[PDB]
């Protein structure tokens, strides 16, 4: 009595929503009134992990494109994306949002009929009418600039405190191992033999001054040795004489790996105690004003 209806709707939860490892809830059902939730005395909320690792035996997130139309079907009012829980009226000519309730129109390239239950006939044919986790292919209207590559620029403290603790040599060995592990994001793992690790790698060390490591190859095709450009202006940061302070890793495989090997030995006898890490992380900003990326400080 009054429990069979609960376990049917609870079954609709477990077979259409986004999976457990992406989203996890405190309570599977919600109260109706503010007087009920004050007597509940337990918090209500969600945990969201949008890029969660998929366990084996569980479906991966499918990719849905909209063709040459380039219009992701969206609610006009709350801008909520299309989801399997909307309601279709007038033989699918209109759809009401399940968040704000506005009755939106169905696009002309989205014209498909309805079955006897009020849902659409191609509901399982299109992946985003049956699964709670979908990955859309966004059109050109959502980009403000062309897609920047994966970018990394490592800040390594090379003061006398850090070289004594072995932080300079532990970090450089880790950076070398991660760049040569073969799992570097931006390397084309879809296997066709062509030189296109688009990843961007820069190196900055810091002490009382801030040091920049030139890494690009020579204009004549020769193998240029790496440079160390000291910059002692720790009040007004600038960039030294290079345009190779931020180079592509595939075109400069040997120069980046060699410079990582030279860093522990070069600052090994450094006797400077003070550091200016605040100026160094500003110095990384001026390098990547045009691309972006990650400081591994």
């Amino acid at each position: 009595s009054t429990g069979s209806a609960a376990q049917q709707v609870l079954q609709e939860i477990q077979q259409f929503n986004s999976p457990r490892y992406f989203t996890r809830a405190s309570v599977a059902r919600v109260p109706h009134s503010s007087s009920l939730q004050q007597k509940l005395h337990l918090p209500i909320g969600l945990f969201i992990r949008p890029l969660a690792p998929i366990r084996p035996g569980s479906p991966t997130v499918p990719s849905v494109n909209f063709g040459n139309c380039g219009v992701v079907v969206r609610c006009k009012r709350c801008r909520t994306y299309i989801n399997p829980f909307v309601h279709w009226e007038a033989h699918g000519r209109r759809w009401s949002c399940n968040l704000c309730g506005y009755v939106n129109d169905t696009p002309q390239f989205y014209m498909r009929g309805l079955d006897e239950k009020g849902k659409r006939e191609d509901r399982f044919e299109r992946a985003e009418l049956s699964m709670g986790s979908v990955e859309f292919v966004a059109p050109a209207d959502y980009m403000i600039r062309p897609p920047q590559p994966p970018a990394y620029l490592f800040l390594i403290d090379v003061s006398a405190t850090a070289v004594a603790s072995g932080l300079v040599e532990s970090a450089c060995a880790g950076i070398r191992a991660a760049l040569t592990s073969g799992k570097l994001p931006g390397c084309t793992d879809s296997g066709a033999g062509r030189g296109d690790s688009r990843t961007m790698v820069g190196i900055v060390t810091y002490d009382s001054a801030v040091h920049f490591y030139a890494l690009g190859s020579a204009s004549g095709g020769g193998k240029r040795r790496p440079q160390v450009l000291v910059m002692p202006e720790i009040d007004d940061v600038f960039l030294p004489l290079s345009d190779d302070l931020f180079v592509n890793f595939a075109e400069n495989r040997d120069a980046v790996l060699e410079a990582l090997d030279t860093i522990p030995s070069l600052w090994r006898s450094n006797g400077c105690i003070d550091n200016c890490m605040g100026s160094a992380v500003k110095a990384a900003l001026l390098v990547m004003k045009h691309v972006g990326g990650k400081i591994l400080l």
């Binding site: 996890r24 945990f47 992990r49 690792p53």
Partner: protein, 200 residues
Amino acid sequence: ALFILGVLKSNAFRPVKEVSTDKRVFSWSRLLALPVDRICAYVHPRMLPLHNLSNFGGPSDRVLDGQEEVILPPALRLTAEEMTQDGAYLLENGEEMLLWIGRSISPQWLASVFGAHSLDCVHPDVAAASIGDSQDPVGLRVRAVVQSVQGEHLCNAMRLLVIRQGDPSEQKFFAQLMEDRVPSLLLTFAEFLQKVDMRS
């Protein structure tokens, strides 16, 4: 009530004189951005026995590969009365591993794992890397346990600090025994349920 009592005894809410300031900063920064499976691992450490690894095995001894799961049945309770002096016990709390070794551990087990002839032949610094080095099947299975709990989480970075009974570093193990009574809260789980039942 077990997990709430866990974070009371953890570094997030311990009294000031036992956890420094910047340790609490990093515990709060972790707990505000970790997934639910690592937060509950922080407030409820998982404990495994390592001294009876030959006992917890089938008659075929199903080869230790990860292709089939490296067998980890027993999840011990977090109180000191099932601790035994001739035992080795591994505790992980989502941040670090502590491998407590008793004073009366078998020397045959010690030579299999770390290659040491005595408990005095082990220091907390190098014996993390010494596991599975002697290539004896007992100690290789200990390294199987260590790497299995390492890779079960997202990240394979979680240090292993081996602790002998009688070193100054023993208190970091015994404080993580959540059902026990620690210097932060002198309450077991039996008493803590009683306190939250009369308050309710």
